[PDB]
């Protein structure tokens, strides 16, 4: 309807991810996870969520979310939410003001604390109305963040706020319960809305997921990291731009095929991308048209795991790779003659685009133009990756569509199979060995994945480099060196990572290795600890084992008993030094291994991430075993 | 075909004796041959020696540590213009070993039509028959069939014999073909071009382990450096093959391809383990044809990242003494020096124990490394251990470097003695 | 219209004119139904009395996602030229007392 430029499918430019309304909240949250300032963090959180006792920041958050997900709220609902905001604001102001008086009465502080916690618990369900959950899931996320913070301060400042030891233990129990209940409710709302939107179109589900990756899931990871003091809050989720027609995708089909095709080789850099382009202007009575028949991303050139998503065929002569040379383009030109000329072209070609000299694309300009003709939809495409014009439209000028995000870079380019059943090869599409491809006559869509800049070192050096200055390191499970067979990719966005590893191998063993390197100036005498995040639904009689392997100098770091638990659990090893592992500034084959024995039919266990933190900077503040 | 016949002869009259020579300096090891005999039925195809150990042998072996579970043929029959006699073509062979890996692919082609419809609608296309009728005033229906024949492994997991044969026919300096295929007791294909005499492919003391083909009419000089043991796709496109190759393995290897592990007994005094009978192998590994080792090959490690590792699964039978002392012998060829050396390790449910570390010096010949004595109680392995593993490992290499592993020897300390020193040259 | 039956450009060579082409397709789903594609030439000569007197030609329509499918029934005099493979189609007696079929 308009020929104006687009910005990530939107009519006006979008807000940078570091400039959103929830950014200072997340920044101080990470600062506090690093080092928690007792009996003082709740005031800062309250000043950042309700600045000057005003709900204006929450209205800004609501407006930004409404703009992103294309869902507005009725004025009555807005009035109800503001009423609840002011109700919380009154009690919060009372409690925050009473504490800053030097020499206050602790019993009155205890009363105010109880009133505030009760008021928050009471007004929480107002944001969980599913009819509007898609919009309120962000607003909900902040509220629990205001509450989970409070309780923690209450657990730390005990007799200072008039709490007895039984009060502290009851608060610890309440925290250990709420940190799981809030996550369960948040994930309930997320999965409901995501499945509902994907059943309509994949693009809308991807947009909702991109919104939750910024306003929701980092805070859930922060919740999961609040019981400690010293770990690093870091998000490695990717933003997915979808350009093309609408395709309905089931939720069983998302985490069974579509996400796997979107990720490809999860620990490899994109090196080549190939498109199957088709143009035809047969009978001039019908306008020109263009088709995208298939996308082929190539990461590791010597592995051959990823295959055609769509089809790479250009003709029916069964000649596409013989005579040594692969076919590239076929153009057929037809000439007619009427006594009372107009050559017709039919082109089927393979467009190739390699990775630039700096190994990564930063932006893109992909767009599609629709046309109606006797209740029939014709397409035209425009493709440009970085500075290389891959395809200009032969059907007329098409407005641009700048796909870019400040602080992100293009990591993957894939598509979605259109017009075929997406219910097959679920149990076959593993991480390795098996072929990652799906046949379909056309796709008519392109999906681009932007990864944050903090993951740019791994996809360039294939290893995790350690520095002396940093105090905490987070390693996602997908950034490995090699993984065993019968392993799957599980979408766990609540972990603030691009996924987790599901081991389900009934032979040999299940193992995952990670490459570690040391920078010049790294102290090898400093003591460190390892933290492993795993979910063990079925009992493992051999347990999980964390081992250090360095040029045959294998050393056992930890062995943990695996008991059945339908939730995430953290295992903490004993302290160690890098001189005990025999790793120096010249070690190039250092490896950390997480291993377990073979499983039984129907069993599997999940691995999310790893935390490496100095012994001095790590302390457990809230015990998890006291339920 | 003639090269394969010569190789089958040397596998019986030559190479076992060379292995015996290589094992004469000791006293206690086991002389055992695991070479396979290859029956080739079809037309003649010239193959270079660089192309044999670079593509053809790799396509003939397939998954070297997996049992054959399915075999699919692409059959074509046509009697177009009755002036020309009937003819039959073998357009492609597809062997399927591990159903959940997907490593092996079509050798030839699995296409049946040009409508690009072979896997849509949920169901894979199986057969296409076109029947043509004519009319002359002065009837004879013509058939054109393109189908996919499927044959799974029998109830006893292995075929013992076969009856594959081909019949040639000349017609105006043009060669027409007819085929007959039977695997075990299952008639896969009877010839529609007339009766063809049988051709009993069988060997007393051997069983069918692999069924493959050779690409005909295409250059065999590509994808040499890509066709590895794992990860990469093991396939080669060609319009026709017109040949079938069957590999018979000796009966002594029947336990491994059925139990996927090496079972140990108390009665035997020596055990030999070929390198190809592993549980898992690292990437960037290749198959090297070393028939002088009396095995179906050796492993070439050439990985410039992480590490090069090969693991073997070991199980113990009831009545095995765990207090008896044993030794390990590793046969390797190390052309380029390895500063980290080779390492033999024992991994049993996290009870990892280091068995040996050997300095790797450059040597263009085969060398044996002997570990110190050990007992199975030191490794923590019992009659119930199901995840016992022996690992041979080395660090990453440089560009152009590689090292070879042939076999392993497990013999009791009492029954092993070095009689002729190899270091005294 | 057109008398073509295939795209192999083979309709009158080898002395004999092509009459019928039937292609049968077989599929396989692990979780059979042969498909037929027939293109043929139906021939009907004039009867012994040189003229047809009546006929029974009819067509049946079917709707499927705003797409019209057809089925036909053809009978000239007493010779059944074509019975419908898409289901039974009611008759349509084309005849006039005092007239005879002259052109088709």
Numbering used by the authors:
A (entry chain A): 14 to 353, 357 to 643
B (entry chain A): 216 to 353, 357 to 643
C (entry chain A): 323 to 353, 357 to 429
Quote the passages of the study that discuss this structure, keeping the authors' original sentences:
Cry11Aa and Cry11Ba are the two most potent toxins produced by mosquitocidal Bacillus thuringiensis subsp. israelensis and jegathesan, respectively. These are produced during sporulation and are remarkably stable in a variety of conditions, but dissolve after ingestion under the high alkaline pH levels characteristic of the larval mosquito midgut.
We then focused on Cry11Aa E583, a residue sitting at the intramolecular interface between domain I and domain III. This was indeed the case, with an SP50 (pH at which 50% of crystals are dissolved) of 12.6 ± 1.0 for crystals of the E583Q mutant, compared to 11.2 ± 1.0 for WT Cry11Aa crystals. The dissolution profile was also altered, showing a reduced slope and no visible plateau up to pH 14. Thus, the alteration of the protonation state of residues and water molecules at the intramolecular interface between domain I and domain III may be involved in the early step of Cry11Aa crystal dissolution.
